[PDB]
């Protein structure tokens, strides 16, 4: 390069940031997903459709572990997701090299969003087009956080991103409640995934990862086919 370093994102005359608003439009056209925190662990569920019968399903993964107790999914564009995964993989290690202790789930979201917010203000790059959902049962109580391309972050009992995310928002408000179990949370997570999916729902149409206090765990397609009995 040369040293141009000028930010391509400036304020509107109305007083808004236009490119961040356009990046959220790419998030809303992403694949639908949902995440539910119910009183002993967190359940994450995504909606993985192969566009043809020729694709392999055991190659590309959506529910992705970060530590042995921290998982992470997304709703947005594919290639930009794999950047900040590898960033967050390394960033969890410098906590562990210094403190010799597994990093809390609130501590990544401080640091991952700080990577992501500074990346918008920096020069000559677009923002990301990926929102995240981060889970983990650190110190008994589990956690469920949601970041966005605007750099912000929140803390949800249960939420949904992707397509028809406002329809599943009204669905989770009525169906879910204060407390549940882990097994009840998976039942309603498929019920809001069946709200917007296609016709057939098999072990390859969806992919589910969970947290316990025993640790983060990703479900194999056997038990997902086994939990597919009494569907939605």
């Amino acid at each position: 390069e040369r040293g141009y370093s000028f930010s391509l994102t400036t304020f509107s005359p109305s007083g808004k940031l236009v490119q961040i608003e356009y990046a959220l439009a790419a998030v809303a056209g992403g694949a639908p997903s949902v995440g539910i925190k119910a009183a002993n662990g967190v359940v994450l569920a995504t909606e993985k459709k192969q566009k043809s019968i020729l694709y392999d399903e055991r190659s590309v993964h959506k529910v992705e572990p970060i530590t042995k107790h921290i998982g992470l999914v997304y709703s947005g564009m594919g290639p930009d997701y794999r950047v900040l995964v590898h960033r967050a993989r390394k960033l969890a290690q410098q906590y562990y090299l210094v403190y010799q202790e597994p990093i809390p789930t609130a501590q990544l979201v401080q640091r991952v969003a700080s990577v992501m917010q500074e990346y918008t203000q920096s020069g000559g790059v677009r923002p990301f087009g990926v929102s995240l959902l981060i889970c983990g049962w650190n110190e008994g109580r589990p956690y469920l956080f949601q970041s966005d391309p605007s750099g912000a972050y929140f803390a949800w009992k249960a939420t949904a991103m992707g397509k028809n995310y406002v329809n599943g928002k009204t669905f989770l408000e009525k169906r879910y409640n204060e407390d549940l179990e882990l097994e009840d949370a998976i039942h309603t997570a498929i019920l809001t995934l069946k709200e917007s999916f296609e016709g057939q729902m098999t072990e390859d149409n969806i992919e589910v990862g969970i947290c316990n206090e025993a640790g983060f765990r990703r479900l194999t397609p056997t038990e997902v086919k086994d939990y597919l009995a009494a569907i939605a």
Partner: protein
């Protein structure tokens, strides 16, 4: 040696449900004392202290660098610091100066921030941690301090006899040392209160 420039002694001892830590008071340059109020024990939160011995430059330097990183940790998180977390923090700070090392040997004592569970450890000048269950010592007069605690420490001790054991351990070992002395301060902390006493030692 460089460690024997100013001298000093730091002792910690684990009791039943409480922990005690003590140090001397003399500040001197190789034969010549200057004062009797040189602080070597510094509070790091409640129910958790730290003691430093060795070169008096690195005593005052590391205790401020550690306080620098500690306040940033307790503001990014909402909680206080765990004693294992501090031991990993100090071992990081000494290992950064791997080849230009600080000439000090820290001693950490404190309780659980959740329970009454005590904790003691000591580190090298380059940062090797070492946890025990009875006592840790540091300073120039190390061998005299091992002769006390191997012959006086008992496993389950009330806070009264723990005070009487660590007092007789310091007053007999430091008076055998030449470059250390001029008074001993003793911290004995527990779940509900913190007790600080100063002993009557030989001022020669």
């Amino acid at each position: 040696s460089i460690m024997s420039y100013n001298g000093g002694a730091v002792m910690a001892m684990k009791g039943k449900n409480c922990v005690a830590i003590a140090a001397d008071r003399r500040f001197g340059i190789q034969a010549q004392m200057v004062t009797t109020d040189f602080q070597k024990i510094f509070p790091m939160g409640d129910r958790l202290y730290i003691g430093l011995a060795g070169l008096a430059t690195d005593v005052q330097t590391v205790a401020q660098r550690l306080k620098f990183r500690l306040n940033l940790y307790e503001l990014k998180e909402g909680r206080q610091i765990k004693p294992y977390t501090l031991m990993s923090m100090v071992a990081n700070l000494l290992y950064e100066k791997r080849f230009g090392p600080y000439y000090t040997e820290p001693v950490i004592a404190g309780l659980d921030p959740k329970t009454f569970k005590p904790f003691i450890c000591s580190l090298d000048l380059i940062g090797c941690p070492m946890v025990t269950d009875d006592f840790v010592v540091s300073g120039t007069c190390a061998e005299q301090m091992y002769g006390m605690c191997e012959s006086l420490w008992e496993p389950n001790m009330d806070p009264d006899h723990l005070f009487e054991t660590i007092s007789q351990a310091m007053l007999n070992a430091v008076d055998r040392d030449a470059v250390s002395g001029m008074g001993v301060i003793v911290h004995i902390i527990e779940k509900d209160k913190i007790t600080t006493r100063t002993l009557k030692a030989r001022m020669d």
